[PDB]
Amino acid sequence: KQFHTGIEIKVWAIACFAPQRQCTEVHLKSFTEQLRKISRDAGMPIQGQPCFCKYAQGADSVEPMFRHLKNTYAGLQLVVVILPGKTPVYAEVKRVGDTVLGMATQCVQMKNVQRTTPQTLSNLCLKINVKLG
Ligand SMILES: Nc1ncnc2c1ncn2[C@@H]1O[C@H](COP(=O)(O)O)[C@@H](O)[C@H]1O
């Protein structure tokens, strides 16, 4: 439950399973900037430039995507996964990340990317801190 120091997240990825027309590029860039600042201020800095940011659709897209990521980006520390409401994509991200490829993933809801609040960003930093701590 305690906050872990020493975490720096330099290589990370975004997979957006929410529809681009709903969660546009500027939503992603804005969400990301807000996340960079609060994680910085908290002392678990996530660098502002993700190594990869793409839209995907459907649970079947998850495993080919993570394979690509794992095959392409050495030192990949985290995949942030944006979800549009209740979706089987969540189950699949966890199956593949935790069980198949050993890749750390953190899911977040589309609504919290379209409009951030300090508290929802805080919730996310803590979930991330526990994971990589
Ligand atoms: N069945 C589901 N469908 C969509 N989103 C989910 C589901 N289960 C959990 N989540 C979201 O996943 C996030 C937690 O992800 P994680 O901490 O990576 O396990 C929470 O913010 C939830 O909103």
Please provide the distance, in angstroms rounded to a whole number, between the alpha carbons at the two ends of the chain. Answer: 10
Sign of the four-CA dihedral 47, 52, 58, 63: negative
Q: Which domain holds residue 101?
A: 8-133
How far does residue 126's CA lie from ligand 1's centre (Å)? 14
3 falls within a domain: no
Tokens linked to 108: 């977040």
- Tell me how many domains the chain contains: 1
Instruction: Tell me the one-letter amino acid at 100.
Output: V
**Do residues 50 and 12 touch, judged by C-beta distance below 8 A?**
yes
DSSP 9: B
Select from 89, 25, 87, 17 the least CA-distant residue to 57. 17
Residue nearest to atom 20 of ligand 1 (CA): 108
Residue 109: phi, psi to the nearest 5? -85, 140
Q: Which residues contact 84 (CB under 8 A, 6 or more apart)?
A: 17, 18, 19, 22, 23, 110
Q: Is the CB of 129 under 6 A from ligand 1?
A: no
130 falls within a domain: yes
22 falls within a domain: yes
Instruction: State which approach was used to obtain the coordinates.
Output: X-ray
**119 burial via Cβ count (<10 Å: 0-12, 13-18, 19+):** exposed
Residue nearest to atom 21 of ligand 1 (CA): 108
94 falls within a domain: yes
Beta-carbon count within 10 A of 96 CB: 22
Q: Is the CB of 106 under 6 A from ligand 1?
A: yes
How far does residue 7's CA lie from ligand 1's centre (Å)? 23
Resolution (A): 2.1
